Amino acid sequence: SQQPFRPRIKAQLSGSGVSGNTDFEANYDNLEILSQTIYPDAFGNSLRSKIKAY
Amino acid sequence: SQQPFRPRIKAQLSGSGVSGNTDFEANYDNLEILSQTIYPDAFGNSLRSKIKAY
């Protein structure tokens, strides 16, 4: 559809978790999603011919 | 149905009745009845574990 496209990547998961008998809720991790927006451009060229006879 | 319960007891007659051919209405006796109401109450305890691997 040549609409502006948007690709997404999943960032790698980092950050220290939880040690020992500690609740998962003491250090949540963040699922991080990055994106890009690709917009189209229009471009062109043209040749103008001379009189048919020539 | 664990609704607040009500037990009842019947007391003892203590009136002097009628003696000769005197009739019952001359001294009526009183059937006296007593009661108590028992309400419920909720209590409880709990234990929270460690991590399953521990």
Swiss-Prot record, chains A, B:
Protein origin, superkingdom: Viruses
Q: What is this protein called?
A: Major structural protein ORF14
State the species of origin. Helicobacter pylori bacteriophage KHP30
- What stretch of the parent protein is included here? 56 to 109 of 381
